[PDB]
mmCIF file of C-alpha atoms in Angstrom:
data_model
loop_
_atom_site.group_PDB
_atom_site.id
_atom_site.type_symbol
_atom_site.label_atom_id
_atom_site.label_comp_id
_atom_site.label_asym_id
_atom_site.label_seq_id
_atom_site.Cartn_x
_atom_site.Cartn_y
_atom_site.Cartn_z
ATOM 1 C CA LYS A 208 -0.545 0.067 0.168
ATOM 2 C CA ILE A 209 2.458 2.614 1.074
ATOM 3 C CA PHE A 210 5.910 0.765 1.351
ATOM 4 C CA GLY A 211 8.775 1.155 -0.658
ATOM 5 C CA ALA A 212 11.394 -1.937 0.099
ATOM 6 C CA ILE A 213 9.806 -2.718 3.166
ATOM 7 C CA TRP A 214 9.019 -5.645 2.962
ATOM 8 C CA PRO A 215 12.185 -6.976 0.502
ATOM 9 C CA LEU A 216 14.278 -4.977 3.124
ATOM 10 C CA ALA A 217 12.980 -7.029 6.060
ATOM 11 C CA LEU A 218 14.533 -10.619 5.158
ATOM 12 C CA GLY A 219 17.502 -8.533 3.318
ATOM 13 C CA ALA A 220 19.282 -7.454 6.786
ATOM 14 C CA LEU A 221 17.442 -11.064 8.351
ATOM 15 C CA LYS A 222 20.598 -12.927 6.543
ATOM 16 C CA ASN A 223 22.809 -10.535 7.635
ATOM 17 C CA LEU A 224 22.745 -11.728 11.204
ATOM 18 C CA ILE A 225 22.023 -15.646 11.026
ATOM 19 C CA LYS A 226 24.460 -15.866 8.200
#
């Protein structure tokens, strides 16, 4: 609705921690 790169950027930062 009003979120540009919020959903795709979410998992993007996830791997940066677990991986």
